Amino acid sequence: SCSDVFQYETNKVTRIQSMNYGTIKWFFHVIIFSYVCFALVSDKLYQRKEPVISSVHTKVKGIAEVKEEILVHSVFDTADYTFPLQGNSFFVMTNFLKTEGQEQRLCPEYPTRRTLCSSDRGCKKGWMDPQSKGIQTGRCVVYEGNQKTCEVSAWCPIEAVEEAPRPALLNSAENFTVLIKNNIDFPGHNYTTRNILPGLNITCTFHKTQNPQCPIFRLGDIFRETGDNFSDVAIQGGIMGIEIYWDCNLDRWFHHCRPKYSFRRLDDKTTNVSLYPGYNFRYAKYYKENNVEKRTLIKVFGIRFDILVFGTGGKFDIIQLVVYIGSTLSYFGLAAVFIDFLIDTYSSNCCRSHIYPWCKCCQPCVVNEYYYRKKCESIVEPKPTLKYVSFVDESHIRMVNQQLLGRSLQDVKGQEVPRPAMDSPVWCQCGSCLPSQLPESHRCLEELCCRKKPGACITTSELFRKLVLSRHVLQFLLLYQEPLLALDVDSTNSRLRHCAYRCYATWRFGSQDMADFAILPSCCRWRIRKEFPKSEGQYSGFKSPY
Amino acid sequence: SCSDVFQYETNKVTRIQSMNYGTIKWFFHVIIFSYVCFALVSDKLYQRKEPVISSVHTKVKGIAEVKEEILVHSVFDTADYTFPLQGNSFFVMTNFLKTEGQEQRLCPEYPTRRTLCSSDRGCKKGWMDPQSKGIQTGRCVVYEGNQKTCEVSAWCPIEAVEEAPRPALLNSAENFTVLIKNNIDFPGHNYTTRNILPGLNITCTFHKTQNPQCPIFRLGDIFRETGDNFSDVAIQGGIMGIEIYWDCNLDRWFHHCRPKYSFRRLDDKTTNVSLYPGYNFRYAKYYKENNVEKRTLIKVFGIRFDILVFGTGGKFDIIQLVVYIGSTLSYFGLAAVFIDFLIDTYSSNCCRSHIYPWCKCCQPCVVNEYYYRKKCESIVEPKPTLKYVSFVDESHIRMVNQQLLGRSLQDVKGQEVPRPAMDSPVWCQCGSCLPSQLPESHRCLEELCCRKKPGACITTSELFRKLVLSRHVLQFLLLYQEPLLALDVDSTNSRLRHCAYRCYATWRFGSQDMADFAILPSCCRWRIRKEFPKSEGQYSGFKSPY
Amino acid sequence: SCSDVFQYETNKVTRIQSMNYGTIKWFFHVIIFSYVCFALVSDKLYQRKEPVISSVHTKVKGIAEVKEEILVHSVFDTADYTFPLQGNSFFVMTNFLKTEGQEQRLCPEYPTRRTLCSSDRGCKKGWMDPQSKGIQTGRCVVYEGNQKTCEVSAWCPIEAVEEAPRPALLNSAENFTVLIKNNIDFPGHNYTTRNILPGLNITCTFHKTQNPQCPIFRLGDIFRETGDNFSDVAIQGGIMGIEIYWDCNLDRWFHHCRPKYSFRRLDDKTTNVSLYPGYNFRYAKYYKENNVEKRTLIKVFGIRFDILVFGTGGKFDIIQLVVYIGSTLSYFGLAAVFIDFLIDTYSSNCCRSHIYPWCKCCQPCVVNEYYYRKKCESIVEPKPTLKYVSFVDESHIRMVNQQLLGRSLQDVKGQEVPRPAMDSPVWCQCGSCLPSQLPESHRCLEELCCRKKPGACITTSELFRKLVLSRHVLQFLLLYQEPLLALDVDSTNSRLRHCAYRCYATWRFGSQDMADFAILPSCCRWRIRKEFPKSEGQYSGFKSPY
Ligand SMILES: CC(C)CCC[C@@H](C)[C@H]1CC[C@H]2[C@@H]3CC=C4C[C@@H](OC(=O)CCC(=O)O)CC[C@]4(C)[C@H]3CC[C@]12C
Ligand SMILES: CC(C)CCC[C@@H](C)[C@H]1CC[C@H]2[C@@H]3CC=C4C[C@@H](OC(=O)CCC(=O)O)CC[C@]4(C)[C@H]3CC[C@]12C
Ligand SMILES: CC(C)CCC[C@@H](C)[C@H]1CC[C@H]2[C@@H]3CC=C4C[C@@H](OC(=O)CCC(=O)O)CC[C@]4(C)[C@H]3CC[C@]12C
Ligand SMILES: *[C@@H]1O[C@H](CO)[C@@H](O[C@@H]2O[C@H](CO)[C@@H](O)[C@H](O)[C@H]2NC(C)=O)[C@H](O)[C@H]1NC(C)=O
Ligand SMILES: *[C@@H]1O[C@H](CO)[C@@H](O[C@@H]2O[C@H](CO)[C@@H](O)[C@H](O)[C@H]2NC(C)=O)[C@H](O)[C@H]1NC(C)=O
Ligand SMILES: *[C@@H]1O[C@H](CO)[C@@H](O[C@@H]2O[C@H](CO)[C@@H](O)[C@H](O)[C@H]2NC(C)=O)[C@H](O)[C@H]1NC(C)=O
Ligand SMILES: *[C@@H]1O[C@H](CO)[C@@H](O[C@@H]2O[C@H](CO)[C@@H](O)[C@H](O)[C@H]2NC(C)=O)[C@H](O)[C@H]1NC(C)=O
Ligand SMILES: Nc1nc2c(ncn2[C@@H]2O[C@H](COP(=O)(O)OP(=O)(O)O)[C@@H](O)[C@H]2O)c(=O)[nH]1
Ligand SMILES: Nc1nc2c(ncn2[C@@H]2O[C@H](COP(=O)(O)OP(=O)(O)O)[C@@H](O)[C@H]2O)c(=O)[nH]1
Ligand SMILES: Nc1nc2c(ncn2[C@@H]2O[C@H](COP(=O)(O)OP(=O)(O)O)[C@@H](O)[C@H]2O)c(=O)[nH]1
Ligand SMILES: *C(=O)CCCCCCCCCCCCCCC
Ligand SMILES: *C(=O)CCCCCCCCCCCCCCC
Ligand SMILES: *C(=O)CCCCCCCCCCCCCCC
Ligand SMILES: *C(=O)CCCCCCCCCCCCCCC
Ligand SMILES: *C(=O)CCCCCCCCCCCCCCC
Ligand SMILES: *C(=O)CCCCCCCCCCCCCCC
Ligand code: NA
Ligand SMILES: [Zn+2]
Ligand SMILES: [Zn+2]
Ligand SMILES: [Zn+2]
Ligand SMILES: [Zn+2]
Ligand SMILES: [Zn+2]
Ligand SMILES: [Zn+2]
């Protein structure tokens, strides 16, 4: 109903005045809160992070004097050593080999072990070797004098097999400068900045400590940073990485979006010719001379500079913070988990029978028995088979959640439970019990005696006659609930019989949890039925409430 | 104060010995833990993942014999069929159309339906058609014999409208090989590796099962993988993707960082000429012949290979694991939520009056009544309007949280509550009540009788005279709290009057929660006031504690 | 054991029938659930998001009539104004400066302030100025007539220092069109789509409202969108961004994967010549004329269009949803936290002694005293030093968890605690106490009197003689636990002495929590020992249970 909707259940708690557990709780809480705040700040988990969208524009500056045997000196400019390719990459030629006046004809292949032939049997027509730039014609030919090489259809004259020039022809390229303009955007955050800000000094060169924001880089300085030697790499070439990292906080109070520049060689420093070490490409200049298409083939060596731009932009997001806080909230209940585990363990008797005698430092932790007693109440499943049995000659109570397979309940011994400390037949050991008058199937239930060993019956006790058999007590108990009650003698006697069973069960078992499922001894049962007999019929006996 | 800071509140709990609920709890816990661990391992939620920073370097190898009508055979090398463009992409020419000796002049446009004119009226001076590479001059001209085309300023001779050659001139390009060198970095994790490791066989070609780590790829094999036909795509061209995936675990014990190679065609397999199918571009060779700038225009068809490199690098992060664990901790309380929901539902009487008679399989779930009784205590808001009423002729108690609008409290019937089973006037049905002597506004409160229907007054009960009106009982109760108390007769009588109200309320209502807000019947009230009258003045009556 | 494994502990709770707290709980729950669902939907936190892998293919269409003084008109096509560079970028030449017939020789440098020399002293041999494309030879030379410039080895004739042409020679480039084909993939989700779908109109041009899905873009329209003027940027050049955003939901029921096109200028709108404003590059055409390698140097101005493709693809992931729900579950316990905080504060007496008299609106919140009483039970650490003391002349009880440094326990006054309202020597103020017969070290414990101020001893009370000293009461209490008990007179007397201590402690302190650690007054102690003396020996006294 409506009145049941507007309810609030609060947990019943026990507040413990303990230095140890209070200190533990607050230590746990402070550590957890400090780590939670530290993780939040360090990893900026309150921030939504957006990857950087980058655009790079490079401007390489520098001229080189190049000396080639012919000896002639020439000046190379950007139009000569730079091949406009990309923005996130630029290439600087550092060396070259020139093959001039090539033509599509038949020519003697350059002398090599795979090529040098003695007769036409050492060459197959149409053979396309992976190591040739030509297709075999089948016949050997004189490359020069004694040398006999396999003729091949290709661009001719064939390239000479020669290593790259040493020293590199554009070794002066380490003195070249590149200006890098990097525009970045965070479209989700709608933020864009660039690496060159107004007022930045433009006549500087980058230095990681002196000028770490000058976007002008000397290539030799890049190689020094990486520990690589420009002169060596210039010969055969390579690939260098210019990393631009953007750790950008777009919170206006803590705003910072500047690049960090780092350098990384990207080509393997290998000498395995099978792997094509360095960085080179064959680039052909075409020109029409003598009404024929010609080719100046240049094997271009150089260094490709890859501009690697990466990073994130963070701005405060409520949802991210909420998610993080919710992911951290359950950690504050671990103090309770730990302390409750301590209360549950140290309440165990084992911790005192064996441990404390050995480790006498832990004895003061016996207070957890009191804490557990005040904290936890143990209850059993109220099953129809549940029965509780008390013997006056025993200090404990037996729980029998076990079917009686025709066995006397006196002989069925179940697990012991402690009594709440509020403060003729063969199975009879008191000589005051009578056989059960129930159906034989259910007769074993009442085959129980007040005592496990021979002795005096509990019926002979004073308190049995004052508590259980006193008409005044039972009448008072009945009137307390029904003050004006008036019943026939038989109905009243039945009520007093029930109240007497109740009184015995409460007296010997205590809690109604046990007294509800208690079983009266035959002696007490039949004494009560003698004090309050029914006019007619037979007694139903124990009927479990569930 | 300080002593209040060092406190620990533990929750009071009820431990249930139940097979069903213990099994349910442990089943829930095991399932939740297993799923939590499985999710953690599978998605590596203990790891901080960094996107890969990639650098690609390609080396295409292969020569092609090209036959063009003129019939002449020529050998194409990389310098011829490759246009150095990028690292994450390479292009292989597969076909071409050559237009030689172009000049900037006035020329007859190539015959087309849009172009063919009969007179100068079919061409507008300065017209720039989207389908022309020229600007109209206004006059028709003879392309050849009868053909009359619109003269146009453009590069001349104009290109012939011809499809790409079939078969492709560089069909042998499927036999070409590309070596891909991929360098990757995880700057946050400070890890870099490359796809070619020392010892990798260099004379292999990639195969997805035999050699899935050879970075040398035959282009035809790529197309076979994709199910595309190289011969067909070579004619008009296309775009192929070489995907390099890096699933890299940088935990040293479980370290693995190798690439997975896959292939994906990236151009639409369309035949819509409006959409410019394939991949072609017009590239012009410039040469000075006859002291004039000329142009050999080549329509270059071929396949662009895009190298797509993606992936993540994971290394264990404490913060990520902490966040995940905290996000999973609350799921362990769902067993408690579920079982408490079961206890709350199955405690409902509805589950037994109607359900169990129908579904007799659920009857053993009646134990939840006991569990709920041992688990939950219901309390009401102690409002000034709160009043509890008990009639001896009823087995229940009425709660009246409702203002008395001049109505007798006997006539005001509130909702019924069950009594805690601890074990002359017109509105009078017992003939022992007197009218209220309070102000008329507050007189209706005491207009209550001990019984709802005619009968004997509860004052005639024995227990009323023994519990409520016995001087010994009240004196004992007062001395129990104040052993040495001694008061004037009037003060003592007032104390006994209060204690008698208390005794009636406790006897008929039980818990002080109800007895505090109980209302004594007029009969009992005035009998008590007769047994313990005050010397002078009038009786204040009921004063709610709140 | 096994029976202890199959247990379920449920929390004991108090259900409060309160409009205020029920409404607060449900308001909290509804707000939290609504925000949780809103965050989930808005941020799609049930989805695993994959970054887009993009491939771009551009096709620029348009021809321009170019007029250069010589005055001659020429038609430029793609082969002329487009430099095949990349897919994610395309370049359109908009202006150029041509330097024809350059040769590698010695030439007079172009007149500038840094260059103009009067004699050979104004030029250093081999000097490589950053602003020169040549290397100084050391001698001045006549550029023209009076002008004297420093001779320099370079490509000659040296380029004239001239601004870019105004108006731009390819100003008609704003009428050019580019078709952008964008293929995207989500490899984890195994989804690929493209921006051109079947049925898309191909004769349109993009408009942000009319045709926001036409992938054909007029460049001038892009600049209008950005608010930039194409004519101005065409002169010196620039960089424009075409952003393609993919917000793609790959859930089939809510599936949508289409691009959003936006435009952003990427070059800084700077006029600082040091920063190389615009976008230009020097591109050289090489031709062999007169058996010499020549160079037509073109300074190419134009606009680079960067195609920026970004976005995510989301598909439902169970793990992500589970993580989010778990991160949100603990927020539902904040209603309980808040209401329990309210119960804990408003139970404070301070809220009534001072606050309510001032703020009389809060008085009805005094019910939290009742709620806290029904919710929280406070217990103390049962330390060996813990002792409770009650004086009959005081209404409260004193807790002494403090060692007695030879001080009489009567003089040691500890903190006050309220009694559970169940309902000759110098330190003696009643004249019935005797000195302690314990060892002097432990004698101060029993140096306690029944009353703090002079008066009658509690032993003179009737209830002391009826409850504590009545043999019947104690015998009944002993038989209630041991009905058939029979002991020697000395053992029985010891049992009655213990039970009398128990009865006094229970009567004056109540709960066994206090009565366990209570200290009997010397008067009561010795009266009890007189009523039940031991045959021989001395009395041990108080022994703390812990
Ligand atoms: C870790 C747990 C235990 C405690 C939770 C701490 C939070 C209260 C902190 C974490 C991140 C903090 C935020 C970090 C960044 C910002 C941005 C800041 O705004 C700006 O800096 C920009 C101002 C502008 O928008 O113009 C305002 C404070 C705020 C929201 C902070 C408010 C306090 C927050 C939410
Ligand atoms: C899912 C819930 C219920 C249980 C939590 C399980 C954790 C205890 C697991 C999850 C991930 C595990 C980690 C996975 C990876 C590593 C890296 C491993 O280190 C290495 O492999 C590299 C060693 C090196 O650093 O040189 C050390 C163990 C550790 C921290 C593991 C420790 C155990 C962890 C934290
Ligand atoms: C926010 C808290 C308090 C409540 C949790 C809500 C969930 C039950 C919602 C959140 C996201 C929802 C999902 C969003 C998307 C989908 C995909 C949908 O499948 C499709 O659309 C594609 C069908 C196909 O696979 O072919 C099926 C429903 C499902 C799983 C939804 C089921 C209901 C979900 C898990
Ligand atoms: C950097 O590289 C250059 C070129 O490889 C090294 O100089 C060469 O060193 C070898 C061995 O001594 C000589 O035979 C060559 O004649 C040198 N060439 C030049 C250009 O002088 C140079 O030594 C390397 N750097 C360092 C520091 O060792
Ligand atoms: C790719 O290379 C293979 C191997 O050279 C070619 O197949 C050969 O083709 C010739 C001419 O038809 C035959 O004489 C050979 O017997 C073939 N060899 C094998 C092993 O089959 C193939 O034609 C080439 N493909 C293209 C498109 O050029
Ligand atoms: C792969 O593509 C080639 C070229 O389109 C196909 O070969 C052509 O097929 C048509 C139809 O039979 C013939 O008219 C042409 O003469 C063929 N050209 C060549 C080069 O032979 C080839 O059939 C396609 N692959 C497959 C398996 O069908
Ligand atoms: C867009 O740019 C063009 C070129 O800069 C501007 O046209 C020039 O404007 C100046 C100043 O009035 C004149 O001296 C030039 O002769 C103009 N050039 C041309 C090509 O006409 C134009 O004004 C700019 N757009 C707007 C709207 O101001
Ligand atoms: N706990 C308990 N209850 C009993 C016992 N014997 C009888 N009762 C209760 O007494 C009632 C039956 O009374 P009884 O004299 O046995 O049968 P009756 O004469 O037919 O009413 C039922 O409510 C039983 O639960 C017993 O040994 N233990
Ligand atoms: N629960 C309850 N308390 C009552 C009732 N009548 C009086 N009291 C209490 O008795 C005290 C007043 O005593 P009373 O004889 O009514 O008035 P007095 O003579 O002025 O003291 C107050 O503490 C009341 O709360 C009643 O019907 N029910
Ligand atoms: N709470 C409490 N227990 C007491 C006090 N005096 C004695 N006892 C208990 O009584 C028992 C000792 O009885 P006592 O006559 O003092 O000594 P005994 O004659 O050697 O047995 C122990 O269990 C004590 O805890 C007292 O003042 N307070
Ligand atoms: C007598 O019964 C003493 C036995 C104590 C058993 C508890 C042992 C404590 C060690 C931890 C056991 C639980 C695992 C917790 C892992 C963090
Ligand atoms: C007896 O009850 C002693 C129990 C004490 C439990 C503490 C066990 C060590 C764990 C300490 C962890 C927190 C650091 C110390 C807090 C002061
Ligand atoms: C008599 O009162 C029996 C009525 C039982 C009502 C409970 C019905 C159980 C079905 C679930 C209802 C709550 C929704 C839970 C969704 C997971
Ligand atoms: C009466 O109290 C029976 C209640 C039993 C509750 C179980 C209802 C079915 C839900 C089971 C979910 C867990 C799987 C089975 C555990 C053994
Ligand atoms: C008398 O004792 C009244 C004092 C009340 C103290 C409580 C003050 C309430 C304000 C909040 C204090 C706790 C911080 C909560 C932050 C959200
Ligand atoms: C006395 O016990 C009054 C306590 C009332 C607590 C409410 C204090 C204000 C916080 C309200 C937050 C939720 C919105 C209002 C719910 C109806
Ligand atoms: Na949580
Ligand atoms: Zn017997
Ligand atoms: Zn017996
Ligand atoms: Zn009446
Ligand atoms: Zn009456
Ligand atoms: Zn004294
Ligand atoms: Zn005294």
How would you explain this protein's 3D organization?
3 copies of one chain form a homotrimer. Helix content of chain A is 27%, strand content 29%. The first copy, chain A, has 4 domains: 13-43 and 319-375, no CATH class; 53-100 and 159-313, atp-gated p2x4 ion channel fold (Sandwich); 110-157, no CATH class; 386-531, no CATH class. In chain A, strands 3, 7, 8, 9, 13, 14, 15 and 16 form an 8-stranded mixed β-sheet that branches. In chain A, strands 4, 10, 11 and 12 form a 4-stranded antiparallel β-sheet that branches. Chain A is built from 15 helices and 20 strands. Chain A is of the alpha+beta class and 546 residues long. In chain A, helix 2 runs antiparallel to helix 7 (334-346). The interface between B and C is large, with 95 and 77 residues. Strand 2 (13-17) of chain B pairs antiparallel with strand 1 of chain C, so a sheet runs across the interface. The structure holds cholesterol hemisuccinate (3 copies), a molecule of 2 linked components (NAG-NAG) (4 copies), guanosine-5'-diphosphate (3 copies), palmitic acid (6 copies), sodium ion and zinc ion (6 copies). One zinc ion binds at residues 430, 432-433, 449-450, 457-459, 521, 523 of chain A. It is classed as membrane protein.
